[model samples]
Every structure is written in C-alpha cells, then in structure tokens.
Target: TLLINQPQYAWLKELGLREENEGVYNGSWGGRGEVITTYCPANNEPIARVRQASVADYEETVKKAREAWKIWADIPAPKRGEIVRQIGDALREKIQVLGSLVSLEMGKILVEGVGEVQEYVDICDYAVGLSRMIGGPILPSERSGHALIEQWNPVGLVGIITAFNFPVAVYGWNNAIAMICGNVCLWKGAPTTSLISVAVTKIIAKVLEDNKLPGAICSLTCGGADIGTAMAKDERVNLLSFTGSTQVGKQVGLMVQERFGRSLLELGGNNAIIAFEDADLSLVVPSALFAAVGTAGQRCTTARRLFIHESIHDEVVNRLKKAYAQIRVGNPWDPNVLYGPLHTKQAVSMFLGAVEEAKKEGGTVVYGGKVMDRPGNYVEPTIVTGLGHDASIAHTETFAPILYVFKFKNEEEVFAWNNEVKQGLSSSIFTKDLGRIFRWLGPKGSDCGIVNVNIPTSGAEIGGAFGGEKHTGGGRESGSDAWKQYMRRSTCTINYSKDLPL
Candidate 1:
C-alpha cells in the first residue's frame, strides 16, 4: 500500500524520495539504524521507509557539520546570502510537490501545506535582505580618538528539532536565518515525518552541492527522542532549537543550559480567542472556526479556548456550529478540502479523551464530540461550552481539535482568562472598540508573545518574530531580530589616541 509508487503521487519523485530512503545526510546519505516506514495519516497506509540514524551516524554528522561551519562562517555575509537565495529558488522550484508531501504526511490541508512552504520561501527572501542589514550600530565614543561598536558573529552548529505539525516551515524558519547568520544546521524532525525531512534536505543539499558548499552546511539526522536528547546534551551543538511539547522542551532547555549552550525553544501553546459583545458576528465566527479547527487543531498556536462576552456567548457558539458544519473534510491533499485528519491515531484518541473529559467537567457539547466513522485518524472538530474559565481540562494543552468555550461578562475578566493559561504562544480578540483593541495590545493586555486584534490566533506572518512566553518557550524565530538567536554578539572598542592613561 505504498502511495509513492502510484501515478497520482509521481510528483513526489521530484524530491528524490523512494520506497526506502536514507534518513541521515551529512555531505552523504546513509543511516545504519532501524528502518522505519512512515504512514500517511489520511489513510493509515505506509507511504515509505526511512532508515533511522544511529549514535555513530549522529556523531559523524555533528563533526561534519562543525567542520562545514568553519567554511560557511568565513564566507562574506552577502555572499552567503547568495547561497540562501539559490536555496530559496530551489525551494520555489519544488514548492508544489513539497507542499503535497506535507499534506500527505503531516495531514494539513493542501493550501495550508503549500502556504507553509511559501513561508519558507518568504523567509528566505527576508533573510537575504537581512544579511546586508544584520549588524549592530556604531556607538558614539565619549573619549577623543576612540571608536566603539558592536559585532555579531555566528554560533556554530545550530541543531534544529522540529515537530510533525509543521515539518517544513519550522525548519525553514531556523535554516534560512541561521544560514544567513553564517551558521550550519543539523535537523532532527519528528520521527513520523522522516520522509518530509529527507525530501527537504535533498532540495537544500542540491543547492549546497551546486554552490560547491559542503552538504553538512545543512545536514540531517532523522531519529526519535534519543537523537533529540543527544542534540540537547551535545556541546558541539552551540545552539539547539527544539520545537515540540512543553514537557519535552523543558528537559531540552535544562540539558542545553547544563552545558552552557544556547537553546531556542518553540514549545506548546494553549492559545485562546476572545470575542467582545460589540464585535462583528460574521468576523468572529469564521475567525474562531479557522483558529480552532485548522490543522485539526494541531498548530502550536491553535485556539484551544474561546471566550465570548456574556451577552453574545450563545450566539457566537451557535454561529460556530453552523460554520463548522459547512467545513469540507477529506484527505488533506485533495483540492477544496477545508479540514483533514489528525496527524496520528494517537491524536484522535487524545481528541476523544479530551471530549469525554470536557463532558465530565459539566461542559455542554455545543457541536461535534464524536469520532468521524471513516478511514484514517478522523475526528469531529469539537466545541464545548458551559465550563468554567479555569477548568483543568480546558487549561491543559491537548494537541487536538477540542475548543472550550466560556462566557466573560467584562473586558478585564476576559483578558485575565486569556493570560491564565500556562502556555502563552498566541492570543486574539475580536472587538471593534478602539479602546479595547489598544488595551489588548498594551502592557497589561494579552501576555502571549503573538497578540492579535480582529483576527485569528493562527496564521501569523513571517515578518514578525514568532514564538511565545511562559511554557511556550521564550525563544523567537523567523523574523525581527530573531536571527540574533543564531549568532553571538560582542562589544568592541578601539583607541587611536596618543594618551594611553586617563
């Protein structure tokens, strides 16, 4: 039941993926560890097999990556930007198939899968411009004949560990910026999405080879938690960027800190979408629907909680039910499908468990609380109301489509409820009031890193710094000065004065 061999999936051949693919790429392709077959979540059928990396494979890859960094860092920043430009071109050339692969394996809708790749391409363009503009400012010197400035340099060997939910864009966010900052990367993607990892690496590897750069400049080693753990503890990895669960991210942070190395964590998010009484019902309904059910509620910034003003709570819930009922669900890669399966069967089970828990906690199932009786990991996108804002199950970050709805009588209480969650990655409010919107963006407002007004919590643009605070992890990536995370800073002073003593 391998889908890659099918004529309809012939586009996958453009990415160099085979029935049995190599999972380790450090200037070469090989993995001596166990061979794991990744299945398509939309059909529960094996797609292809990838040989997992062993400890030795990881050891060799790390050494090669560090050695490649020596060469990569020496290239002028703008010249390195040229390499990244070509990479962007390369990604653009294969964006369609790559996006299809994302939909097939990661189980996101086709447009979203394609949009995710466009994000990488967009960031590549962003990084190209940033390469010329990434330096620190020259400071005015108090003393005569003295010059003061700041210098930025690459932190060698960025080890990126990304989750399955966003197999491509997350790595692209780190890879593009890190490369422009003159750092080599070693990626360890979620084990289930190993094929997507291999395909992405292949695209990048060709660009490096064409440019006569070492493939280790963007190396790959695919494995499970063991490889992730090794990357966390490896001092050779100067900066480790891990994106996944908060529980795992905590351990990765401590391990990196123990070695005094830098780690950028993009962890879990139990995000919320709050709607005020005066908000436009049309805008609020669709926004809440997309945020909560998008990617089957698997996005790190997915809206897990929905808070509406008491006066409009019932209306909003009713509107949401109607909108969800109209959603088109099917195989992710199929055209015009608005929703898709959970990325794994385990996630379906989690969704079911969360629904049962919500009902047990005295919440009413306003719409959708049962598993869809069909193939693959299908589950109805659920909306639960009549629960306290502080319900335990509501606060818990379940990576499945279960939206908990609450009614807030006042602005102050609603804002407080949004901040009450431990994982504060993204938060949004739908309100037409000028004062309320500004306040939401103010100092005492939404505590999450990414705050939005009148829009959904998900679909953040690449131009801004992405990631969150609290348990969502403090590290930022993609845009802003996020490139700084991949590099080290130094303050410099030069005195040309004849008088040495002051």
Candidate 2:
C-alpha cells in the first residue's frame, strides 16, 4: 500500500510569532534586520526570514522519512519513473518561483539559478528514460546449458547530504536518480541554504500529489552538523551520498564505512587547469576565468590552480587579469551583476583570510586580493601568482573566488604538478597538440574521474559518470548507470523444467 501525505507546516509557527508587538516582535524589531533576511532574486527584497532547525526537528524528519520509505520502496519502477517525470513537469511549470528561491537562499545569480532548475528537470527526464534501462539482463551459462539473469533492486533508504552551492542541481541529482530506481531518500540540506531546501521540498510534494504518487518518497531534514552525523551513521539508511568539503566528506565516509553501509561521496576538488605553450591564449583566458571564478569558485569542480607553460605565463596572466577586473560584483538580483556576494559572511571571511595567508607566504597578488566594498558578502575576484607547490593555498581546498597561478617549464613538470595535489575530482588541459593531450589523459590521468580537453570541468552531460579519485569521493552520480549505484542487484534462478528431464 502506498501512503502519501503533506509535510506538517504547523511546526513553523512554533519558531516565532508572525504578529507584531507594537511594531516589534518578541522583544525585538518586527522586520528586516531583526532576522537574517533572505531576499528574492526576482527583486532584491526580503522575502523570508530563515530559522535554524533544531536537532529534535531533524530526528522527527528522519522518523517520517523512514516511515515513508516503507511504502516508497514497494512501488514498481515504471510507476516510480512516472512520478519522477511528473516532478520534472512541475519544476518546468514553477521554474521562476523555485529558481528565485534558490538564488535568494544560496546567493547564486538569477540566471545561474534558473539554469540549475532546468538542469534538475533535465536530470529527472534522463532518469525517467533510464527506468527500463536499469532492470535485469539475461546471460547464457555454458556450464549449466541454461540461462542466468541479473536484476537490480532498490535499497531501502538513501541519505543525501547536499552542498549549499547549486542546491537544486545537487539535490535533484540525489533525489531523482534514487527515486527513479525505486528508493526513498532522507535529504539533509545545508544550513546556509535551508530556505531553498524547504521551497523545493514543498514543490516536490505538490508534484507527487498531482501524480497520485507517494509524497513521502523524498523527505527534507534541516539542521547543523549533528543532523548530518546522524544520517551518516544511521543504520536505517542503506546508502549515503554526500557532496561537500573534503574534510566533512572524509568524516562522513568514515562514519558510514565503519557501519559497513554503502556511500557515494562527491567531495572537494583542488582541481587544476593547464595551459600549454601551443594553446591559444585568447581561448584559454576565457575558459580559465570560467573554470576558476565562475560561481565564485564555490563549485567542487572549480579550478583552484592554473598551470601555465612558462613561455605563455605572462601573456595568460595579463589576459586573465583584464577579464577578472571586468566581472561585475553586486546583488545577485541585479540583472547586470555577473557575480554575486559569497554565500555568507563566514565564506567571505574565509576567502579574505586565505588571501592574507597567501601574501604572507610570498605569493604575488596579480589582480584582486581584497573584499569588495559592498553591502553583503562580496569579495573581489582574486588572482595570486608565483606560488610554489608547497604553498598553503596550493595544497588546501579554498572554496572561494580566488585563483592560484603557477608556471610549468616542461611537460614533465606540468604532469608532476598536476598529480601532486592530494584531492583530484576533476581537471582540464588546454592544448592544440594531440600528443600532449594523450600523454596527460592516459594512465596518469587516473587521479581524476572527469577530465576536460579544452573546456572547463564545471559542466558535464547527464549520461556520463561523475566522481573523483584519491580523497575526492567514491561512487558516481548522474551517469548512464547511475540508477545502478542507487540500487543493489539480486539474481534469482530456478529450475523451470525440473519435472521434465534430469
């Protein structure tokens, strides 16, 4: 029996009162600055006041998710895929509203926010197409002179820990893939982007109801680190998929691995982008800027280090500086704004601190290295040159709008510097020489899961596997066989003609 229900909203009232106390509420001003206001991306107006979720609330959500999973997992695959397709349709219908919420809560530019929404819808469409593609395949066995078959089955529950950056796209990757494979999910959204989480959750519920499917298949739990810890360690969760910093990813991996549970981790990437001597400086500059500073360098796939051939080092640096200076940083709601504020004040502080550290370590600040004089969490697009392999910024993963530049003398040096980094989620190389591309993209390229030839590693098609080697992450997400990762396989064989012959 499939059971579907709306998530209780009454608990929101308990956080605080809506009514004003003589233009003040609860011994404080009733509006705006009193609460950390989140703004609508459509217009830079305060639309919602976000409240932090408590541990007890998260526990309740987990219980509800487990209850929902009982029925969700029992649903047949085609029906589940149909429900997922309904979600895609709903997202398409409500793109503006959902996209604005994501921008408001996560500080992503409005255009990028809409793109994320569309990407999620596309992922759902892809997963729907894969519903029949994920089932069993028949194989012949010569030893028994009979046939053997393998079947994919859903895991009980999936625990998804999503990052604040691209909240909609990341959550869509987790929920759509898992649901299409007939699995329920407990999603622990990042605290900084809880509003996006709540809004998207409500939309998902609406879609499920519209399609006459179970609404509880996807549950949202919001809180701080403790909530994530609980989900990672909880035995009720059959599989765990997380996207975050390398440090937290490692901790989550340890928790789930110790319990012998399955996990798919998309961790940090100290990714690199190399520019060869033969590469076109004009093409490499734009690509490098997008890879390094686009989305304020918060993406795990963002290029943290730029390895340029010594011959074109000065030329590439000059071109990048000119482009970096041209980026317009302001309120995300502004249509003219190319880059918005960092997600939070804390993120801004961390970026500034890293800049200072790089300066102290003898790294040259080529262009920007200071916080922008703005109202919100805004930082200048920073570029640091002349940093060694062991420099603090070189080794650490700083998810900020900053780029570190280095010069490589030869192919041997470039290869060494590329593989020198500990975390390898993705990397890209720009060169016209086929020989150089082949050499770098061969066995030595095993360090990274995704590699780009002349483009940035930020965007990938839904049909290809995405993950990392070393400390980046384990399982793959958004691929041809992504549904298989979300499910476990079981094979059942029987003697059909037992009564016929020996």
Candidate 3:
C-alpha cells in the first residue's frame, strides 16, 4: 500500500498501525519488489499504495467527534468565526506547501493546483466576513408594543463527505462555512486523497488551538464506503453534506432521510454547454474545450454534454477537435503539461468505459477514445459526436475527459434536451443574442442552480451561490451568503407592553 512518508504521518502510522481492509494503493513508490511514489497526472510516475480504514474504527472515531462536538458547538458563533478566520490565515501562510501537495497527490496541473489553494483561501475569507453577517432583522407586530425578529442559529454537528477530485477546496467549502456558523464537523475524505485531508486537518487543528478553540470542532476520517455509511447513519450527525456521484448521493440522501436528518448533497453534474450560431466560434471553442478537459474533466461543473446549433455544429466540432488535439497530456510536474492523469486507474477506466459504451451505441468517436499506455493513469482528451439525447454518456455523469456532442435545430429543442437529464447542477449557453440567454437563465424547467451566459460552464465566481435543483441536491455549497445554508433560523418575539389583539 502507498503511504505518505511525511514525518507526522509516519509517526502516526507507527503509533496506530492496524489493518482494517484490503485494496491496492493507487499511487505508491518503490519498496521491495514494488515501486512506490505519488500519482502524477502529467507524466505517470511513482504511484503509492496505502492502507484503508475499517468500519469499526471509523465508528469509534465518529463517537469521539460527537463527544468533541458537544463542547465545540457550545462555543459562541463569534468565537467560532474567529477560529475560522485563523484557518484562513493559516491557509495563506502554507499555500505553497498545500498547493504542491495537491499537485503531487492528485495530478492537477501545478498552476491550477495553486489556484485551487487560492480559491479555498477565498472561501475562508468569505466565511470571515460572514461573522458580522449573522444578525437578524426585526419585524413589526399587529400589537402596539410587540415585535418579532428572526436570527440564524447553528444546526449542531455536520458530517462532510467529500470527493478526491478537489479534496482541499471542497473541504474548505463545507468545513470553513459550517464551523464559522457554529457547527462542529467530522469530514470523511475520499479514499484516494486521504493523505491530503489528514494534512489539512492538522493545519486546521493548529489554527483552532492557536485561537484557543477546541480541537474537536473539526476532524477527518479516511476509509471506504463503510465508513461513509456509518457517518451518514450516525445519530449524532445533525446535517450531512456530500460531494460525489449521483448514485452515492442518492444512497446518502436515503440514509440521512431515514434518520430524518438534514442533508446537503452536491451530486454528480451532467452539465450542458450550448453554442448557438450567433456566438463567436473562436471564444466558444476554446472555452468549451477547456471546460471539458481542464483538470482532466474532474470538475463537477465541467461541460459534459455539449449542445451545438445545427448551423454551427460542424464548425464547432472541427474547431473543438483541433483544440483537443493541441492539448499536452503528460506529467503534471512538467511546466508545459496542461492536464495530468484522471487521478487514478479507476477514474481512467470509468471515463473510457463511457466512451466505449457510447461507441457501441452508434456514437462516433470524433477524437480520442483510448487510454494512453503511459506510466500513470492517463486518458486522452476524448470527444464523441452523434450521441443521442438518450444515450448513456449524454445523460449519465462521466466526470472524465470525454465530451458528448449533440446538434439541436433551435432554441426550443436545446432547452428541452438540457432539461431532459435527471441531474441539473448547471448549464452554459453561448450567444450574443440576449433573448436566448434570458430563456435559459429564466425559470422554465431549466432547474439548474447556476446558469452561464456566453461563458464556459466552469469558472464560478467567489461569493456566488453554487448548487443545483432536482437531483443535483438541495442547499447551496459556495458563493456569497452561502453560509446561510449551514444554519437554521430562530425567531425571538419581544413584548414590552402587554397588548391584546381584537
């Protein structure tokens, strides 16, 4: 198994070594007969093999977290906000180390890895601002001296289950905001990125201790599905926040609902990017290609299903194909490498599996279709054409570097097809025509949480709400005033003079 050899990790492993489950560690370096190194997307190199956590141990950890939360949640919101701000400061101080860790562990291009760190910092900064944003407004009553006011309140402990793709950023999204709003968090990190999660928790713990805050306010656990199951069903968890596949999201939702608990799910996204004839082809092509293949298409908001107007379908396809061909797929450590691997062998297989399925279903592999036999888990940036609206790849969330292209005759058909998918997290329409943008942006079964006009589906601004309706999940995760989603409301009524209503 691949294990990170950082001094702290080594010490912890030595002190608490136990085998809970069995699986091949994906990124490991050389040891004995096996080579061990971290997974890099750009040029597949030393992959590491690490151990998995057990369900029984995970349950014990959750109990400890619950015990910690009892005291952590008792701290006032203002103090919690101060601790969150300290985390933001710590992130700023260690941005370089954190960014490099992401680049090495997950294979994100180095530059983009830095950007992810910055984005996380931004999320925490916004959370700092939310401290003063906590008060409520008073409402007048029918009685002469009576008044009513509503205030936001914490919802106790929250369990955050995050994906491996953007481990640090996603954690910051859930943890910083939830903690600032006075909720203690127990994060179950993705198996592949457990090391990074462990590192982040150490930093946060340091920040909490520095601010004289309880360490139990935040913690992390790593394991497989069983650990997640335990966390989701644990009676101590008040709110459940998840960022993963739609299938898993459904299961998590059921577990939470079965307990009658609050759940905030940022499930899989089969986001659509529409390019109308009126749009500028040059800008749309590059933007769409980047959106489809950036970070090797690991983003939940990456453009998966591309809808091109019939008038410009051929031109768009040709331009996009050329653009993808120019993309440099190699070692993420390489300065010129635009994208690294798809995170792991499983991710590579899952992506190409969809392409294979698409080809079997009469879809044309217009560009890439095969995995590169490179040292790491690499897949060519693939583009498939002629996939029908009902095709599996078109409807299902792939979360890979495969783009499904479909041609629509007009705006009505495009809008209909965009709304056809079960998942509707976000949608992007490229057009100079304001009417078309308005149509997609306006509420008419569009159901998407965020709509992009004349831009790629990617690139969400800081302080803007990010989430989707329907299967995409309920409750916002990121954006301005997003902290509200992590809190419940309390109303206080004051009656200075006793007044009777007729």
Candidate 4:
C-alpha cells in the first residue's frame, strides 16, 4: 500500500510531500525533468513522487543563487545567524513528523531519524553563536603606520551534494554554516531522498520568505549525478561540499580541481574498532554490536573491522553474538526496533555479495549471512571471524551490516592494521589502560579523522570537526573551523603613511 495516502502517514504532508511533489525550489517550486517516486525502504513501496530537475532548472537556480548571494552577503553576519536560529526553531516545531518521514523514506529507525533532525537543529543553534565570532585576527605590521589584518568573506554560492543515508543532517550542516558565513547555498540531495529535500527546503523557504529575504539564499534542485557534476565543474558555485562514495567523490574532486573550484569531499570509510586486553568487555561487546549494525551499517563511519586482543577474543565474540541476537529487527519506524532493512534491494544484493566474498576469503560467518525472507530489503547483520587482518574482503567497504572480526596479540600491529586501510574515516578503542589511551590519542595512534576512546566508531558528536583523511576525503564540516571552508580569507594591509616601500 502507498503510505503517503494513508491517514497514519498524513505527517508526510506536514513536510509538504504529496503523491506527486515538485522537486525544484529557487524562491519558487517546479521541476520539469523525470518524475521519480521515492519508496519506503522498510517496505519497498512507493511513499511519494517528486518531479526531478532538468539542466535548465539547475542553470536558472544557480544564477538566482549567485544574485541572491550579493544581497545576502551584505547583511551583517549576526543578522544572518538570526535567520538560521529561526530555521532551527522551525525544524524543532516539526521534528517529530519530519523525523517520521525520514524513517519512512530513508529507513533509519524512528529514534535515529529524530536524532538526525535534532542534530540539524543543534547545528543551527551553534551557527547562530558562531556567526558573531567567525572572523580572523589582526597581526603586527612590519612597516610603520601600516595596518595588517585578515578578513573572511563569503565565497558567493556554495553547492552542497549530500548522500542518501543522511538526507537531512548533512545538508543542514552545510546549509547552517554556509548561511551564517553569508554564502547562498544550492543543494542537490540524493535522488532517492528528493521528498526529504523538498520538505526541508519548504521549511527553509518559509524562514527566508518570512524574513523578506531571497528564497534563493537556500535553493534546492532534486536530481542525480548530472546536477552534482555540474556543480563540481561550474566556476560560479565557488565552494562545493560533497558527501558520497569514495569512487564517486574522487571523480567529483577531479572535476572540481580541473575547474580550480574549491571542493569539500566527505567520502567512504573502512573504519575499525580495536579492543585490548584491558578493555571492558561489557562496553566492547555492545559498542561493537551498535557500531557494526546501526543504521544497517550504512554509515560512512560504520565499524567494519573489529580487532580483539588474543586473551579476550573468544569471550568478546561470544558476547557480541548474544547481543546481536537480542537486537530487535523490523520496520524501522516500528517502536523498539533496533535494526531496519538495507536502503534498497541493491544494497541487499551487495550485502549478499560481500558475505559470499568473505566466505571465499576463508572467513567463517559467526552470526548472520543471509538475506531475510521479508517484505523489505532485510539482511542478517553478519559477523565474520577467522579472517586475516589484511583480507581483501575486509578492506573493502560493503556499506552493509557485516563486521569482520580479527584477533591480535600486540598493540603495535593492531594499531598499524587500523590505519592500513585506504579509507580512514573513523576509528575507536575500548580500553581502560590510561597509558594506552594516551598513546591512542597521540600522533602514532589511529589516523582516522574522528578517533575515539572507549566509544564506538559511529555516533560522533556534531561539536567536533567531522571528516577524514586519505580516500575518506580530507574535508571537515559541521564544527571546529569548518565554517572557514565556506568563506575566503584575504590578507588586508593599509598603508596610511602614504609611502611606497621598495
């Protein structure tokens, strides 16, 4: 049955979604390209349809965004923060319904769906305070009667391309910060999540229209790779923030580099969780279960590898197996369900392929390895043991719930193993030794962007800069000085002495 037309799913309408929704918004709403229907991943049934954006629509939207940037940039930064604050409030008002919509369309559990929305609201609040504090410092001038200072200005139009897994929060991270930095944003969300894009843009458009500001300040064009490639190559975009697979991100990076346009690429992760002998098995087991299977293990920071010290390896694996068996699996929106279906049937097939490859690579499936015979794209949250640390199947990111377990006897070897992967997004260690904790945080420790102590590799806080090194893509967003990426820095010196120095 189509959920959008059901009375229980009426909340979808609250987000401005309908059976057929317009997927383009640039101070207006329309899309003349392909009309695609977004399905509920939990049931693999149509939820709503969105008319996609054509090249002409993208062109007009980009032009309008640049024009809007001229007016938006001149507004005081704090004033722009006020608008973001209002956007946060608007998000808060609809958090529950919007979160449910995320569950319906993107297939994360209800709580996680809601938590993702809360993250956006929290970032908006953070950006409001940061708006007043986003400038560079003054430095001493070498010459007499000369003033030296650094100034930050918007890079005009910022194009944001987000992935399907995080349909809302990722865009919110780029939008809230870019807006506060006085840059207009043109968003191209994942093609599958067009309805979510439309709903979020509707919320933002109201905030802009209410403030009598240009809705083009935050524009939306719902399409696939064509629009994303256009943004990467278009010089007018100024700064392009992209989040997706490593393979796709590499091409996007090359296109942007060819054009000499600034690009922020948050790509794939083949993260690891290492447990030493001193680690609390209580914490280690649950952390491994959650990190490996949460969001059906689709998160970029999902812990795909688990390295356990030889002394406690068997006990920990046994405990993790028990915990995974206890995980409640069902429709994501169903209350108390901890696991959901893979985002698509394609993901389900990939999960099967990875599990088969693991078997061929001499790994034993310790827990789950079969696609669940269910209505949706469900798969067993698999745990594989007896694989070498350097197994080829282990190194590849399958983007599904498959945790490859390995045993290690020493710290040096395991630490190296954690960093050996080409994708270095997030890593973690669950241990009690104080010295080892310090070492793990030291320069020689895990080289992933988001390193952790006694925590899972996933569920990173928004306050820290979120991104990774190597193939994971060296781009930071949401926190720290990530706002700097959206702006341009200029060294300004004034020679009030009116004399030229040779």
On residues 1-502, what C-alpha lDDT tens digit does candidate 1 reach at each position? 7888888887888889898999999999999999999988988988889999999999999999989888888899999999989989999999889999999888999999999999999999988899999999999999789999999999899999999999999999999999999999999999999999999999999999988999999999999999999999999999999999899999999999999999998999989888888889989898888888888888888888888887988888888888889988898988889999998888888888888898898999988889999999999988898999889898898988888998888888889989987888999988889989999999989999999988899857888899899998899998788888988999999998788684
User: Per-residue lDDT for 238-271 in model 3, tens only?
Assistant: 8888888888999999998998998888887888
- lDDT, candidate 3, at 145: 80
Residue 435 deviation, candidate 1, in Å? Answer: 1.7
Query: Can you give the TM-score per candidate against the true fold?
Result: 0.98, 0.88, 0.89, 0.98
- lDDT per residue as tens, model 2, 261-286: 99898988888888888887878899
**True-structure RMSD for candidate 3:** 5.3
What are the C-alpha RMSDs, in order, of all predicted structures?
A: 1.1, 7.1, 5.3, 1.1
| Whole-model lDDT values for every prediction | 0.91, 0.75, 0.75, 0.91
In model 2, the Cα lDDT at residue 190 comes to: 73
lDDT of 4: 0.91
Q: Candidate 2 lDDT (Cα, whole model)?
A: 0.75
